[PDB]
Amino acid sequence: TCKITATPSQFQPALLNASKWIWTGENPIPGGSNIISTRPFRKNITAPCGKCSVCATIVVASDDAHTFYVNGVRIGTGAGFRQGQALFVALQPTWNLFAIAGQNLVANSPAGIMASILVHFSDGTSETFVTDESWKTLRAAPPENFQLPSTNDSNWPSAAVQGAYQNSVWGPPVLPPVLPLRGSNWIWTSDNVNGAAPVGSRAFRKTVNQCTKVAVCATVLIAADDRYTLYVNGATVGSGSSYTVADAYTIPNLHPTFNTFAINATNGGGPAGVIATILITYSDGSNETVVTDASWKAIQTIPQGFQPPLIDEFGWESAKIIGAFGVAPWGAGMVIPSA
Ligand SMILES: *[C@@H]1O[C@H](CO)[C@@H](O[C@@H]2O[C@H](CO)[C@@H](O)[C@H](O)[C@H]2NC(C)=O)[C@H](O)[C@H]1NC(C)=O
Ligand SMILES: *[C@@H]1O[C@H](CO)[C@@H](O[C@@H]2O[C@H](CO)[C@@H](O)[C@H](O)[C@H]2NC(C)=O)[C@H](O)[C@H]1NC(C)=O
Numbered sequence: 001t002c003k004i005t006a007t008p009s010q011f012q013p014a015l016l017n018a019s020k021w022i023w024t025g026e027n028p029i030p031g032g033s034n035i036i037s038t039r040p041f042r043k044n045i046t047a048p049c050g051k052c053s054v055c056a057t058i059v060v061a062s063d064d065a066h067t068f069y070v071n072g073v074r075i076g077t078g079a080g081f082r083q084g085q086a087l088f089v090a091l092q093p094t095w096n097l098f099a100i101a102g103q104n105l106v107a108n109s110p111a112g113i114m115a116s117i118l119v120h121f122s123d124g125t126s127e128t129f130v131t132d133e134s135w136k137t138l139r140a141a142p143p144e145n146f147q148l149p150s151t152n153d154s155n156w157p158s159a160a161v162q163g164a165y166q167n168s169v170w171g172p173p174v175l176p177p178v179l180p181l182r183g184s185n186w187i188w189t190s191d192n193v194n195g196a197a198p199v200g201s202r203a204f205r206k207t208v209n210q211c212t213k214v215a216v217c218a219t220v221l222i223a224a225d226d227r228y229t230l231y232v233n234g235a236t237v238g239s240g241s242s243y244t245v246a247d248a249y250t251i252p253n254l255h256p257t258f259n260t261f262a263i264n265a266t267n268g269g270g271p272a273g274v275i276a277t278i279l280i281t282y283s284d285g286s287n288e289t290v291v292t293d294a295s296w297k298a299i300q301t302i303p304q305g306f307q308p309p310l311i312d313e314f315g316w317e318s319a320k321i322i323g324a325f326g327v328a329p330w331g332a333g334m335v336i337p338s339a
């Protein structure tokens, strides 16, 4: 219902610094011993002002495990307090019901859930929402359909705070990478032969087109040896020149059904490659991941308009897999921005 005037930008990490650990308060000592149990947590969050909410980056950690729901839909499952888990989800424009089922799995041990929800709005702004005492819970196993908006949480008690980011039994969870490179492939043109490749620029193209769904936001993690410039639906998103520090980008104004990612990557000499991971969120709560692989198309001499969405791909080849993320010479040490 709002015009999206947000444009592609550098990825903005959701942080855990303002967030709180929550549980039920069955033990009034925070951080105290709790029984083996499963417990529900809910929060209805509304968009401010004359702002529409579009999508969200979530970071969630638990002692011991969780399941995360948005507007009734399961988005993810995770565990552990040492490191957060990254989730991405499209949102309803004016309100969104977040719900989490947490489990304590060890007897007499502490229990708790911590999250941060960075909501991106139509106008290009953002706000972080956190787990805290304003969430609702129950001192009992979650009812059938606790996560659906149609459940009335009006008589539920308030959640009890177990600790804060810096001051808790858990200590501060480490942020995960925004997206994994494990799972992707360094690619190039066919050109790249014995730890190769020649000195040109080369172009790569991937199209995603699920005509029965509505695509909302994309997040892109990318790096290249040496340098790249990245385009989505013909517009310039960004560029880089490091094969040891990756760049991440947010595309909040995706086309609903058809989107094209294109890269001009340049080899200055020696080995060469481009690697990327892309996550696209859909309005029904589902998502998809695309990675650099052989489904991408590539070409040795870059034509005018290589970046437009609808060009003829005749005489582009299947991109060559140089190797899975990890291979020499680049190794596994890429610095990846935090979620
Ligand atoms: C993308 O959505 C799906 C669910 O709609 C999520 O993952 C599936 O469910 C779990 C939960 O983390 C994963 O273990 C599996 O990998 C998926 N199924 C398998 C292996 O069979 C996923 O969390 C979502 N990703 C986000 C939101 O970033
Ligand atoms: C989350 O909060 C919103 C805003 O308070 C609720 O939506 C409103 O519901 C009222 C009465 O039920 C309607 O008359 C309004 O038109 C709605 N307001 C807006 C701004 O949309 C929403 O129902 C809540 N969701 C849940 C699951 O509790």
Ligand SMILES: *[C@@H]1O[C@H](CO)[C@@H](O[C@@H]2O[C@H](CO)[C@@H](O)[C@H](O)[C@H]2NC(C)=O)[C@H](O)[C@H]1NC(C)=O
Pocket (backbone or CB within 6 Å): 201, 229, 264, 265, 266, 302
């Ligand atoms: C692909 O990218 C490379 C590197 O960014 C381009 O080569 C540069 O282009 C400018 C033209 O504006 C030249 O003045 C420079 O010689 C190059 N600069 C550097 C720093 O190497 C190449 O032209 C790109 N575009 C296409 C469509 O191929």
Ligand SMILES: [Ca+2]
Pocket (backbone or CB within 6 Å): 063, 064, 104, 105, 106, 109, 110, 111
């Ligand atoms: Ca525990």
Ligand SMILES: [Ca+2]
Pocket (backbone or CB within 6 Å): 225, 226, 267, 268, 269, 270, 271, 272
């Ligand atoms: Ca090189």
